[PDB]
């Protein structure tokens, strides 16, 4: 079988869409192509492929008649086509679907839209006559939910834009569908609009949802006769017992570190969407800190929201090492430690204010395919604090689909941040930014990107540490690999999401695969490159680390796990590589 009888176009322009019931589909595709090219009389006589071709016809205009219950200007605009355009069956179908959608917008749930082109062969033109019957307005009598055997009905009815006892809007139901997808509590959402048997003008709306399991709270204790007892445990949840409250409580206790954190929040404190929540934490590592914060926030439009809150943290340090950056800070604070003398202490009570702004137009909770998200967070100190500073972090991500089936997608992921002191004071060094690891740039050891400490005499560990740590040998300034973090950072990654031809159906909605290229850098400020001219200049922002690789994301029964491998291409002295990485994500 081949293509026979084409003179307007050659077969090389047509066979490219053929697989040579597949043939019936290819023949319908070719017929649609010709109809969309003005060939009003194009058809197929028989399959052997004997083609009959016509000429090209141009549209003369569109007439519309029928039971148009107002909105005539909108219909005219939808059907307004400039004269001279070629006849196109697809355009006609599109116009009919746009009319149906427009009518649905105002409650005409079941319009009847049909059209018939008049083909003028003496003069090659097509005049279209459209017959529209708007029908009656529909009202929603009951809204019901099925499948929600764990979550409370109160949750599903708040993520809705269609109220009972009012006219139907198709877009007002679809918005509900999207908001439920944005909640992140369901595997799938679908809809139905079944007519009420007792009246031609009333319809019910039914949503089908399937909840995924969440939380997976863990615990465990390491133990041995050499290692002793090491306890770690915690619980995390997004939809605790189905009430919509988020909970996070974790902690650990061992012979070198002890800490705990609790964070609880209510996305809907009030009926109109005002949210409240907060957290408490304690972490004593053998330096200690502890504190609390409370945040309130609310929406300002369908896509944007604001947050703000207050809190307090206590920070107490001791036995600090003689680092140049740390001592610069301490001197800026008025401290005068003795050179290379480990005997020291410092503690402050810092009262702060934090705030932020978000935007979220993503289509899915965990595997978005379109849209973008922006998260801008600021933090400032207030009078009465010992450390006067501000910070800003911007985190954005945009998904752009390529494929109609959304298998080919390009993701832009970027993060930037900065911060500084007030009044001529320095930023505390324990608030510095770090990068590297699966959360930022893959292929590098965690918190290894950035400038490193230079060490300068008394210590209780003198004999055991490196020669520049031991105070019998630590006679001068030494370079080290001990990352201290910085006051500025930037990270970016370009990730391509592709099909997964190597997975079975059970993974069809659980496994995503992508290719990526990562870049980023961390740098400082207030770096006196003259005094420390014998070491690298940390103020140079051009030493950007770069790597690329492949990753797979799997929404396993135990939560979102990420497996990846990447290799570096751009590395600077002092960096440490890590080529194979795996982490539990519970983010993105």
């Amino acid at each position: 079988i081949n293509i026979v009888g084409n003179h307007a176009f050659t077969t090389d322009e047509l066979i490219s869409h053929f697989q040579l019931q597949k043939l019936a589909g290819d023949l319908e595709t070719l017929r649609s192509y010709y109809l969309d090219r003005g060939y009003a009389r194009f058809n197929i006589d028989s399959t052997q492929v004997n083609i009959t071709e016509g000429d090209q016809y141009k549209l003369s205009g569109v007439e519309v008649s029928g039971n148009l219950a107002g909105h005539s200007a909108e219909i005219e605009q939808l059907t307004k086509i400039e004269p001279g355009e070629l006849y196109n069956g697809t355009k006609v179908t599109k116009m009919e679907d746009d009319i149906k959608k427009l009518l649905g917008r105002y409650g005409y749930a079941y319009p009847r839209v049909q059209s018939m082109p008049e083909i003028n062969d003496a003069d090659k033109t097509v005049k279209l006559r459209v017959n529209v019957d708007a029908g009656n307005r529909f009202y929603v009598r009951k809204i019901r939910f099925e499948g929600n055997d764990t979550s409370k009905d109160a949750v599903l009815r708040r993520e809705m834009r269609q109220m009972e006892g009012a006219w139907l809007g198709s877009d007002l139901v679809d918005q509900g569908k999207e908001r439920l997808n944005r909640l992140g509590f369901f595997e799938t959402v679908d809809t139905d609009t079944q007519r009420v048997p007792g009246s031609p003008d009333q319809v019910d709306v039914v949503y089908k949802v399937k909840e995924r399991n969440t939380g997976c709270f863990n615990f465990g204790i390491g133990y041995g006769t050499e290692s002793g007892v090491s306890f770690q445990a915690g619980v995390q949840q997004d939809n605790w017992l189905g009430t919509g409250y988020a909970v996070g409580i974790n902690g650990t206790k061992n012979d070198y570190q002890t800490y705990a954190e609790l964070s609880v929040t209510n996305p809907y404190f009030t009926v109109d969407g005002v949210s409240l929540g907060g957290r408490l934490f304690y972490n004593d590592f053998q330096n200690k800190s502890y504190g609390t914060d409370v945040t309130l926030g609310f929406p300002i439009n369908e896509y944007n929201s604001l947050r703000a809150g207050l809190g307090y943290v206590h920070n107490s340090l001791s036995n600090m090492q003689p680092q140049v950056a740390m001592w610069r800070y301490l001197y800026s604070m008025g401290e005068h430690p003795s050179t290379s003398d480990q005997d020291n202490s410092f503690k402050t009570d810092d009262f702060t204010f934090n705030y932020g702004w978000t935007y979220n137009k993503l289509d899915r909770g965990y595997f978005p395919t379109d849209g973008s998200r922006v998260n801008l967070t600021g933090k400032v100190t207030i009078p009465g604090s010992d450390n006067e500073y501000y910070k800003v972090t911007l985190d954005t991500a945009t998904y752009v689909p390529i494929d109609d089936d959304h298998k080919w997608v390009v993701l832009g992921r970027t993060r930037w941040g900065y911060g500084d002191g007030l009044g001529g004071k320095e930023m505390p060094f324990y608030e510095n930014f770090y990068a590297g690891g699966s959360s930022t740039v893959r292929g590098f050891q965690s918190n290894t990107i950035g400038p490193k400490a230079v060490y300068f005499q008394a210590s209780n560990y003198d004999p055991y540490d490196y020669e520049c740590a031991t105070q019998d040998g630590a006679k001068d300034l030494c370079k080290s690999d001990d990352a201290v973090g910085g006051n500025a950072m930037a990270v970016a990654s370009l990730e391509f999401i592709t099909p997964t031809p190597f997975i079975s159906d059970k993974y069809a909605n659980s496994v995503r695969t992508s290719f990526f290229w990562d870049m980023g850098t961390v740098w400082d400020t207030n770096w006196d490159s003259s005094q420390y001219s014998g070491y690298p200049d940390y103020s140079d922002p051009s030493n950007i680390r770069m790597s690329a690789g492949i990753a797979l994301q799997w929404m396993s029964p135990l939560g979102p796990l990420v497996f990846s491998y990447a290799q570096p291409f751009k590395k600077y002295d002092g960096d440490k590589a890590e080529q194979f990485q795996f982490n539990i994500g519970k983010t993105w």
Binding site: R141, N148, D153, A154, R158, L241, V271
Partner: protein, 213 residues
């Protein structure tokens, strides 16, 4: 031989591991699918699946049995088991443990259970299980009224006053005898006052006084 398998299954049903009783019953169906006592095995599997909470299997076994035995001297036992099987789905061990109010969750399972118990009670009025079925019907009816009550409260909070009035009237038609319906009356009194429909607010207040304690 089938006598030893039957004896083992009975011993495992009387006490011990019900899963072993399941194994013995499946062995009976695999080895003697058409024996003279295969009906006993099918009923024993239904019971054991219920006991182990293997609800999808109890349901499949029941539908199979009914198709196999459109009529039977003890068909009311099977229907009773249907009612228990449907009630068994409307629960959660964690929700019970933490004192969670289950009435706000999908009531469809309760509706199916209600329907099967009604069919049983009406078809076999002299069955020994009638008293339990009627007590369960009262319980389930109250649960459905609570479901409607909670929905009405949500729409009241949102100000969807037409939905509040329409749904409560529905409650009046479907659950005329329940505490939830009496408790809902002020919702109608309020809805008819937020909208200037004073005659109905007065009628509601009158029915409240007439039925107040």
């Amino acid at each position: 031989p089938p006598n030893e398998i039957y004896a083992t299954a009975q011993q495992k049903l009387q006490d011990g591991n019900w899963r072993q009783a399941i194994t013995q019953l499946e062995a009976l169906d695999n080895r003697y699918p058409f024996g003279p006592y295969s009906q006993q095995v099918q009923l024993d599997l239904i019971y054991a699946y219920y006991k182990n909470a293997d609800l999808p299997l109890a349901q499949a076994a029941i539908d199979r049995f009914i198709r196999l035995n459109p009529t039977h001297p003890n068909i009311d036992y099977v229907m009773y088991m249907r009612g228990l099987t449907n009630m068994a789905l409307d629960d959660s061990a964690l929700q019970g443990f933490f004192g969670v109010d289950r009435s706000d969750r999908d009531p469809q399972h309760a509706r199916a259970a209600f329907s099967d118990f009604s069919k049983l009670v009406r078809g076999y009025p002299n069955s020994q299980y009638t008293t339990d079925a009627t007590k369960r019907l009262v319980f389930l009816k109250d649960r459905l009224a609570k479901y409607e009550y909670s929905v009405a409260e949500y729409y009241t909070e949102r100000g969807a006053w037409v939905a509040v009035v329409n749904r409560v009237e529905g409650m009046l038609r479907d659950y005329p005898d329940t505490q939830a319906t009496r408790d809902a009356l002020p919702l109608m009194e309020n809805a008819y006052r937020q909208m200037q429909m004073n005659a109905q607010a007065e009628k509601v207040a009158k029915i409240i006084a007439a039925n107040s304690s």
